[PDB]
Design a protein around this ligand. Sequence first.
Ligand SMILES: Cc1cc2nc3c(=O)[nH]c(=O)nc-3n(C[C@H](O)[C@H](O)[C@H](O)COP(=O)(O)OP(=O)(O)OC[C@H]3O[C@@H](n4cnc5c(N)ncnc54)[C@H](O)[C@@H]3O)c2cc1C
Ligand SMILES: Cc1cc2nc3c(=O)[nH]c(=O)nc-3n(C[C@H](O)[C@H](O)[C@H](O)COP(=O)(O)OP(=O)(O)OC[C@H]3O[C@@H](n4cnc5c(N)ncnc54)[C@H](O)[C@@H]3O)c2cc1C
Ligand SMILES: [Cl-]
Lengths: 122, 126
Amino acid sequence: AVTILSATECWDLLKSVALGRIVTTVDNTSHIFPINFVVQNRTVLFRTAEGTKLVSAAINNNVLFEADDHDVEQGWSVIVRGVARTVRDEADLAEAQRAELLPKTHWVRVLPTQITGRRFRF
Amino acid sequence: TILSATECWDLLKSVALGRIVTTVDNTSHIFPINFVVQNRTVLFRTAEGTKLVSAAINNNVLFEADDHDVEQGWSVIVRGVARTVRDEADLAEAQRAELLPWTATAKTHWVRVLPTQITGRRFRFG
Ligand SMILES: Cc1cc2nc3c(=O)[nH]c(=O)nc-3n(C[C@H](O)[C@H](O)[C@H](O)COP(=O)(O)OP(=O)(O)OC[C@H]3O[C@@H](n4cnc5c(N)ncnc54)[C@H](O)[C@@H]3O)c2cc1C
Ligand SMILES: Cc1cc2nc3c(=O)[nH]c(=O)nc-3n(C[C@H](O)[C@H](O)[C@H](O)COP(=O)(O)OP(=O)(O)OC[C@H]3O[C@@H](n4cnc5c(N)ncnc54)[C@H](O)[C@@H]3O)c2cc1C
Ligand SMILES: [Cl-]
């Protein structure tokens, strides 16, 4: 049947889950970084630890974001292609502070150039 | 906290959903897959005519799976090669696997991620 998901459904499915992965890529070598994230107005907000390779690999680079969930009947997944941008604006920073993330430190947003979703049938 | 190999391979057995990550010329793709662990290998089934087939099989792939509660979480990353199951012993082991069933296609295409490296981390959020 139909398994392609729409944008409004993709962004809300991402909010049902607290854990996703950043995927960075250089030439033919890629890295994956599990992150705790929240969705804010079609952006993927997460917080990054200083001096870690996630900061260097992602910030101001093209990245992949992925999150998924499943039950015994069906599963879904959402992929965001975009760019990781440091939260550096006053209004950007105030919005990031309203985020109910899991319990100095830098905020980062994945700004989407495309978002896609699939549902998988078991 | 860095995790040993024996913790990673067991932690992988605690969850049924992981992701294959394939890479070609500065552009990655990611494929969520239902999987089980069999003798330090990552077993999964592939749907025919799918892009996962062309992208992962016989190429170097990343495999990742994770989990978390309110306090802490973990993740495991496997670097290896995806190879199809082409052997009566391998085939017999793959058919005992506790994998989620899907659809009326009795078409089977067993693939294993043969690990070249496995690593794991524990994370706290503090
Ligand atoms: C459940 C969970 C949630 C996390 N949430 C966040 C978050 O919200 N924000 C954040 O900034 N970071 C988070 N992390 C950490 C992040 O995913 C990476 O572990 C980290 O960015 C790696 O930085 P590093 O400099 O220590 O890597 P390095 O030490 O330079 O990495 C060396 C090698 O270790 C391996 N490795 C590194 N990290 C992992 C990993 N997580 N799992 C498996 N192998 C790994 C890779 O093979 C890598 O090549 C989380 C990790 C986990 C497990
Ligand atoms: C929960 C879950 C479990 C799955 N388990 C398995 C499994 O065990 N075995 C298996 O063979 N397949 C599994 N799949 C499907 C697997 O991800 C497909 O191989 C993948 O969708 C690519 O198939 P395709 O050739 O039709 O994609 P294409 O048509 O080649 O993809 C075109 C574009 O669609 C987008 N896209 C593709 N797949 C996804 C996705 N999953 N989420 C978001 N965007 C996507 C990408 O942007 C991609 O560039 C699962 C999917 C989900 C959601
Ligand atoms: Cl400015």
